[PDB]
Design an enzyme around this catalytic site. Sequence first.
Site, PDB file in Angstrom:
ATOM      1  CB  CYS B 118      -0.943   0.010   1.215  1.00 22.29           C
ATOM      2  SG  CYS B 118      -2.176   1.320   0.978  1.00 22.29           S
ATOM      3  NE  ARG B 121       2.469   0.894   3.551  1.00 24.91           N
ATOM      4  CZ  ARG B 121       3.583   0.181   3.626  1.00 24.91           C
ATOM      5  NH1 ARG B 121       3.852  -0.492   4.736  1.00 24.91           N
ATOM      6  NH2 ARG B 121       4.399   0.092   2.589  1.00 24.91           N
ATOM      7  CD1 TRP B 290      -7.014   8.939  -2.193  1.00 23.17           C
ATOM      8  CD2 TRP B 290      -8.148   9.125  -0.270  1.00 23.17           C
ATOM      9  NE1 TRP B 290      -6.193   9.570  -1.280  1.00 23.17           N
ATOM     10  CE2 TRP B 290      -6.861   9.702  -0.094  1.00 23.17           C
ATOM     11  CE3 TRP B 290      -9.036   9.126   0.812  1.00 23.17           C
ATOM     12  CZ2 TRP B 290      -6.453  10.261   1.116  1.00 23.17           C
ATOM     13  CZ3 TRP B 290      -8.632   9.677   2.010  1.00 23.17           C
ATOM     14  CH2 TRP B 290      -7.344  10.245   2.153  1.00 23.17           C
ATOM     15  CD  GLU B 295      -5.238   2.055  -7.095  1.00 27.57           C
ATOM     16  OE1 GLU B 295      -5.260   3.039  -6.322  1.00 27.57           O
ATOM     17  OE2 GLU B 295      -5.808   0.971  -6.846  1.00 27.57           O
TER      18      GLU B 295
HETATM   19  C1  HEM Z   1      -6.372   6.676   1.411  1.00 28.18           C
HETATM   20  C2  HEM Z   1      -6.088   6.240   0.165  1.00 28.18           C
HETATM   21  C3  HEM Z   1      -5.368   5.093  -0.155  1.00 28.18           C
HETATM   22  C4  HEM Z   1      -4.660   5.001  -1.273  1.00 28.18           C
HETATM   23  C5  HEM Z   1      -4.324   6.158  -2.181  1.00 28.18           C
HETATM   24  C6  HEM Z   1      -4.197   3.649  -1.456  1.00 28.18           C
HETATM   25  C7  HEM Z   1      -3.518   3.182  -2.613  1.00 28.18           C
HETATM   26  C8  HEM Z   1      -3.141   1.844  -2.838  1.00 28.18           C
HETATM   27  C9  HEM Z   1      -2.572   1.325  -4.073  1.00 28.18           C
HETATM   28  C10 HEM Z   1      -2.151   2.078  -5.340  1.00 28.18           C
HETATM   29  C11 HEM Z   1      -2.491  -0.022  -3.930  1.00 28.18           C
HETATM   30  C12 HEM Z   1      -2.139  -1.029  -5.043  1.00 28.18           C
HETATM   31  C13 HEM Z   1      -3.486  -1.411  -5.638  1.00 28.18           C
HETATM   32  C14 HEM Z   1      -3.373  -2.296  -6.860  1.00 28.18           C
HETATM   33  O1  HEM Z   1      -2.511  -2.013  -7.723  1.00 28.18           O
HETATM   34  O2  HEM Z   1      -4.158  -3.261  -6.965  1.00 28.18           O
HETATM   35  C15 HEM Z   1      -2.983  -0.317  -2.610  1.00 28.18           C
HETATM   36  C16 HEM Z   1      -2.944  -1.575  -2.073  1.00 28.18           C
HETATM   37  C17 HEM Z   1      -3.358  -1.881  -0.769  1.00 28.18           C
HETATM   38  N1  HEM Z   1      -3.906  -0.975   0.151  1.00 28.18           N
HETATM   39 FE1  HEM Z   1      -4.122   0.967  -0.052  1.00 28.18          FE
HETATM   40  N2  HEM Z   1      -4.573   2.876  -0.385  1.00 28.18           N
HETATM   41  C18 HEM Z   1      -5.330   3.746   0.415  1.00 28.18           C
HETATM   42  C19 HEM Z   1      -6.096   3.282   1.502  1.00 28.18           C
HETATM   43  C20 HEM Z   1      -6.056   1.998   2.050  1.00 28.18           C
HETATM   44  C21 HEM Z   1      -6.776   1.584   3.235  1.00 28.18           C
HETATM   45  C22 HEM Z   1      -7.913   2.309   3.982  1.00 28.18           C
HETATM   46  C23 HEM Z   1      -6.363   0.321   3.534  1.00 28.18           C
HETATM   47  C24 HEM Z   1      -6.894  -0.540   4.501  1.00 28.18           C
HETATM   48  C25 HEM Z   1      -7.325  -0.185   5.745  1.00 28.18           C
HETATM   49  C26 HEM Z   1      -5.431  -0.049   2.506  1.00 28.18           C
HETATM   50  C27 HEM Z   1      -4.935  -1.341   2.350  1.00 28.18           C
HETATM   51  C28 HEM Z   1      -4.205  -1.764   1.259  1.00 28.18           C
HETATM   52  C29 HEM Z   1      -3.783  -3.130   1.069  1.00 28.18           C
HETATM   53  C30 HEM Z   1      -4.036  -4.281   2.052  1.00 28.18           C
HETATM   54  C31 HEM Z   1      -3.270  -3.212  -0.210  1.00 28.18           C
HETATM   55  C32 HEM Z   1      -2.805  -4.446  -1.002  1.00 28.18           C
HETATM   56  C33 HEM Z   1      -4.040  -5.055  -1.641  1.00 28.18           C
HETATM   57  C34 HEM Z   1      -3.728  -6.253  -2.512  1.00 28.18           C
HETATM   58  O3  HEM Z   1      -2.828  -7.047  -2.150  1.00 28.18           O
HETATM   59  O4  HEM Z   1      -4.406  -6.411  -3.549  1.00 28.18           O
HETATM   60  N3  HEM Z   1      -5.240   0.981   1.585  1.00 28.18           N
HETATM   61  N4  HEM Z   1      -3.401   0.815  -1.930  1.00 28.18           N
HETATM   62  N1  TZC Z   2      -6.518   2.555  -4.173  1.00 30.35           N
HETATM   63  C1  TZC Z   2      -6.718   1.315  -3.735  1.00 30.35           C
HETATM   64  N2  TZC Z   2      -6.281   0.327  -4.528  1.00 30.35           N
HETATM   65  N3  TZC Z   2      -7.389   1.055  -2.441  1.00 30.35           N
HETATM   66  C2  TZC Z   2      -7.752   1.995  -1.456  1.00 30.35           C
HETATM   67  N4  TZC Z   2      -8.368   1.369  -0.385  1.00 30.35           N
HETATM   68  C3  TZC Z   2      -8.414   0.021  -0.662  1.00 30.35           C
HETATM   69  N5  TZC Z   2      -7.825  -0.180  -1.899  1.00 30.35           N
END
Ligand code: HEM
Ligand code: TZC
Lengths: 416, 414
Positions: B118, B121, B290, B295
Amino acid sequence: GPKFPRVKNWELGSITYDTLCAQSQQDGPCTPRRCLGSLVLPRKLQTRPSPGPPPAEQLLSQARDFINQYYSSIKRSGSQAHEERLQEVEAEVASTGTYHLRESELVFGAKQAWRNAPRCVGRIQWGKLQVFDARDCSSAQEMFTYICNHIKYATNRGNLRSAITVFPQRAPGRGDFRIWNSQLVRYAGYRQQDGSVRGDPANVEITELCIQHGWTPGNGRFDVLPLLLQAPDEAPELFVLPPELVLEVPLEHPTLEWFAALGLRWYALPAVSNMLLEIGGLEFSAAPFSGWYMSTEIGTRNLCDPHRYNILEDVAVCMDLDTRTTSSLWKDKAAVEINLAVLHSFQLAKVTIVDHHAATVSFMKHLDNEQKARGGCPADWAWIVPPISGSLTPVFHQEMVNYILSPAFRYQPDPW
Amino acid sequence: KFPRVKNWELGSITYDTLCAQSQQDGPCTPRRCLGSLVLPRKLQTRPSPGPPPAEQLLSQARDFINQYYSSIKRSGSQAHEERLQEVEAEVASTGTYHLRESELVFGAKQAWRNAPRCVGRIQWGKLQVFDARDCSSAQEMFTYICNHIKYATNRGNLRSAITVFPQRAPGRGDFRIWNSQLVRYAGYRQQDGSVRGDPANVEITELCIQHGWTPGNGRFDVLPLLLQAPDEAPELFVLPPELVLEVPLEHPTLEWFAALGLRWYALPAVSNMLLEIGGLEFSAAPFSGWYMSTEIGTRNLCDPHRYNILEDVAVCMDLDTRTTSSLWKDKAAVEINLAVLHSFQLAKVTIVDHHAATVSFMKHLDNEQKARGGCPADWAWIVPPISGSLTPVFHQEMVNYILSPAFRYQPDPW
Ligand code: HEM
Ligand SMILES: NC(=[NH2+])n1cncn1
Ligand code: HEM
Ligand SMILES: C[C@H](O)[C@H](O)[C@H]1CNc2nc(N)[nH]c(=O)c2N1
Ligand SMILES: C[C@H](O)[C@H](O)[C@H]1CNc2nc(N)[nH]c(=O)c2N1
Ligand SMILES: NC(=[NH2+])n1cncn1
Ligand SMILES: [Zn+2]
């Protein structure tokens, strides 16, 4: 299922198993606990200088393994000639502490080393390499002659040919043959008063070393540096390359007419000169190799890295983009045109070059070939995927297994 | 034992000492690196028909409880010692235990914080946690999910949130959300294997139809959810269209872009991952924040196995698709990402471009270097799919490892 790493290509959904890694005889930097796959130089292969002769027992196993690879490659494994060669190597180490490679063995090793390089995306050309044997070289001046011939043959007036020149291996408590420069062709990097850098910031140290050794510096942005060649137990000697031998390409854009006025350019021949070529335990501290460029190397890394020429902003201002906010994607736009410029200019000048699309596509073909021939291909994903348009190329969607195979090209400490 | 970590753009160096706290193994070994692999070959989350080894569970539970009390600066407090005794007492007699809401809230945030893949974070401390452990039916799950969606969307001013459904229990089926995301576009297999819609959702689209959904025939048909209560066939629920905010895509200067009829939903809410806190497992815990523009503009619309709109846009731009060297792909990709950013900005819906996003991640790495001595990160996932080296993270070495609380992948429920 199979007891080996399962590799998947997410675009095509195809699966393969890497059984070749089972042949790795050297450990990398990762452990079940943590992955260090993104580290440029983790303390692994690192060919740190090991002066006092090596364990005869250590060298022998490496030598036997290599000879076995050689005879396998010519389909004579187990033959009388194979067992005799093995006996000869053992006797030679037993009496002199080291041994020597036959001509054809060197050629084979040099090509395998390339073939085994995890970070090289152009390995589909691995079987086509001109191996110049320079194991007879005995002076810094002769090293310079060898190198000039290498450049002449490799540049071939724009129709680039892959080649490697192999100088004398490291020997029992004796000085190494070393090329101090990281590449046969490098642009100077002059440290300015205010702390800025004119030229290429990547070469500040080598530039200063050339000065300390008597080079009269210039003051341009693209001054070709002289070579610091070092024969055994001697201080390095300075050699200036004849301008006519260093082919360069002025950069211009196919439609943006002002780009040429930027006065940017780059050399045609990418010749790495600071890596150690290891074959059967033997170590060739000086074995410069060259091929041709993949456009992103010049267009994205060398010209746009923050710590390199850093021309992104200048080009954006010219294409009059909004460099005040990230969301205008001004960096992305400028980067694309700069890469397009590199490709266009090289094509105009009839100098060999390959774009990141063609390059990766061919590497995929290479992976297919290697799957069949060896059961896998060691590859460093972070280095194989291009610096721009990553997912637009096929390699982005291909999982890769990285590991160390020998022969190999390793990093080695700077001689100074 | 501590890895030296270098940033090649600045020359700065740090040492990751946090990785020493990892108690779960990754896919790599000294012989070979498997860091570029998407899914684990074994690090899965095997069935739960039997109770997890009490010794194993208790140690993870104590670890977590310790983490929690440290977080509220009350380590070794009376409350801390007593909570540990409760946990031990409950496990000893039932083979499992339960979390207090405040602990669940702390665990959820730590799980996000530890997610190596992520890039967003830096927002880890701002997460709205909905406790849905009082759920006993699919219909109830649907109501919880609907509220999560209304809250998170907030008329375009997205707010990060997570809803936690009942933990897994020995010998009993899992609560599960079959869909990979709460909002997904149908993928219909037509004629000669071609696909109308999103190719990534062919299977789930097929399951929905099999369970009674009357399919549409468009390219962006929002799918219904298949929610499953323990040991029951999944149930089908259609999301109120007013709840699913979408953004029609147009370009700031390219008039014809809008004619492509493209669009994408505002809410990225992952719904198939498992949340593990102190040994307990939450099989259904959808989370959302968001989108980072790439993506949508790069992976979703330009992946060859997704909407694959690259050639179409190139042709509309009148680019030379005859050869790779014209960089037509690179050019169209940039305009498509631009269109996404422009469109989301126009509709007043939260989104972050890949430059702004990675810069904030760098700041996060530093905050974490000071706070915990390191930060687990998956380089391959953190670096954007376009303009990689143009972002700061490309030049940052990273150490990847597993820390708990954690979000993990789990087997599809069918
Ligand atoms: C606030 C905005 C946030 C942004 C901009 C963001 C952005 C991202 C991005 C670009 C990825 C890669 C997604 C992909 O290519 O499939 C990702 C993965 C991930 N994010 Fe975030 N994220 C945010 C919020 C969150 C939140 C709220 C959580 C959980 C509480 C979180 C948990 C994760 C996890 C677990 C992954 C890996 C998911 C996977 O293995 O498919 N993210 N996030
Ligand atoms: N941008 C993303 N891939 N995500 C944000 N919160 C959960 N997934
Ligand atoms: C024929 C054209 C070739 C192309 C297009 C090509 C392309 C590349 C590229 C893109 C890189 C990464 C450069 C960087 O990011 O700094 C590279 C690395 C490398 N290549 Fe090739 N290569 C070719 C020929 C060769 C040859 C002839 C050899 C050796 C015989 C070779 C050995 C390697 C090795 C060892 C590396 C790693 C260098 C390092 O770690 O810094 N390549 N190559
Ligand atoms: C930190 C990170 O490993 C580093 O910037 C790597 C990434 N990928 C690369 N890829 C290539 N081809 N060349 C490089 O020098 C790098 N640098
Ligand atoms: C095979 C390779 O690991 C795979 O394509 C990865 C690369 N990086 C990624 N990065 C992000 N953010 N998301 C992804 O799905 C991927 N896919
Ligand atoms: N493109 C490159 N970096 N190289 C080609 N031959 C040797 N290095
Ligand atoms: Zn690894």
